[PDB]
Symmetry: C2
Subunit: 283 residues, 2 copies
């Protein structure tokens, strides 16, 4: 059972009803509820217990993230610092982190609160530049400032030299990231709980480049020759950290884990197929 | 240390010198040697202790597989049934299972016998059709008899329906297989010790198909609609097992493990780069 439920998200104005309905529903069912500060203000919830995201993350037992997969992205990176259960309500179709359909959210959530849920752990990525420490649920991306600019770098795996590369950047994706930016760059789908990390080059210079899937207990090091162009590292499409001259990037499995939960009737492959347009049962 | 070394392989006639040199060298260094029956005959080794591959596999402590990666393929599938160390001498360049270069084989092997080796385990695939039980080091491939013939099937992962497919077949590859047939079908490279298995469709009917990387502790089930065309399963390009009507294919991690060893100066990424034509150290 969950004593304290938190409502997270940042609502255009018609997404507000969802927050409003959920807050009253959760409340009338006897739960203590923490809403995010912005939503309390937006809905004028004078009685509501509010808090920042970190607050909810420390004091709530479950966070219902309302919104899309992108909303979930910033929310998840924080809530993963904590031992809180996270579940999401999407808007319309299923997403890879949001599996409560709005048409049936309450009913499904009602069963989840009863304790009918599938609990799993998504791992995050950690990045140092050398120390700035940033994290990512989907991917870390190395890339220059100019769009079509070829860079050179060497890739070390577990302290040992793996390979050089001439290209426009490298994408490093978690299983959760594999269906994201990495997919659109020609990378493979990894199953969500897999202990793996995929490296996908962007516009490689040689024709023999291919997505490399490595163990998630592996360490990655980026070394660079010289800097007259601006190297940058992005984590989940948040603000690029500049990479200075003589600096290296260190990417590894983070110690923070997203404690996702799902309703019993959830399955990954069904989410995947509906998302990608795969064939359903044929006979 | 290794008491009993076995020489395995099937030698065109100039590959015979290698077998001949190795057998005398191993012998003069004090080892008990088991040669394969064919090679004993081919070299006229009247004193040699011989045996089938299974024999060497049960009685030798190390098998030196002379030849190419293809020679290693049949040899490995058998030697993996046993707790024997396996190392290979290639012919020319490095391969993914053969890392002793002929130009330096003895010297490197001499250090290996001293106990200077990196030991690792490649897992195999197991297939039932329902029961015929066959195994594979590289991949299992579902495909019809006619070359360009579209088939329909459903794929179950861990007893649950994953997705349907219309295509010309499915490749299911181990990490060791990932650099093989699967690669040429547009699949990704998996790192050799990774607990993963990759599914790669062949000529899919829908544009949204993509290599799927799943956990190696996962089970796979192929179900089919009807049979007027001849379905077949191939394991490591050996003779196709026919798949009758009402029959399903079951593919899972086999319990047999290839106990490969490597010399200290071996590294996967160096083998990979030389094989694929990747850039070496740039600075």
């Amino acid at each position: 059972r969950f004593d304290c439920i938190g409502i997270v998200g940042h609502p255009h104005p018609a997404a507000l009803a969802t927050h409003e309905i959920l807050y009253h529903w959760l409340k009338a069912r006897g739960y203590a509820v923490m809403v995010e500060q912005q939503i309390a203000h937006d809905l004028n919830l004078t009685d509501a217990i509010t808090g920042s995201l970190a607050d909810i993350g420390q004091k709530a037992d479950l966070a219902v993230v309302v919104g899309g997969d992108g909303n979930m992205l910033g929310a998840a990176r924080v809530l993963a610092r904590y031992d809180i259960k996270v579940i999401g309500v999407n808007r319309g179709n299923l997403g890879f982190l949001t599996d409560l359909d709005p048409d049936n959210a309450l009913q499904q959530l009602s069963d989840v609160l009863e304790g009918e849920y599938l609990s799993e752990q998504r791992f995050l990525l950690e990045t140092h530049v050398r120390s700035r420490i940033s994290t990512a649920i989907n991917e870390v991306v190395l890339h220059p400032g100019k769009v079509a600019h070829m860079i050179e770098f060497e890739v070390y795996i577990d302290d040992r030299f793996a390979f050089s590369q001439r290209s426009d950047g490298l994408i490093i994706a978690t299983p959760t990231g594999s269906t994201a930016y990495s997919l659109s760059a020609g990378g493979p789908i990894l199953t969500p709980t897999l202990d793996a990390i995929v490296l996908v080059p962007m516009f490689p210079h040689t024709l023999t480049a291919r997505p490399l899937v490595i163990s998630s207990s592996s360490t990655i090091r980026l070394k660079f020759s010289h800097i007259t162009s601006d190297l940058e590292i992005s984590c989940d499409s948040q603000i690029a950290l500049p990479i200075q001259e003589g600096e290296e990037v260190l990417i590894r499995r983070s110690d923070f884990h997203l404690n996702l939960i799902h309703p019993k009737d959830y399955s990954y492959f069904n989410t995947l197929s509906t998302k990608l347009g795969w064939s359903k049962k044929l006979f």
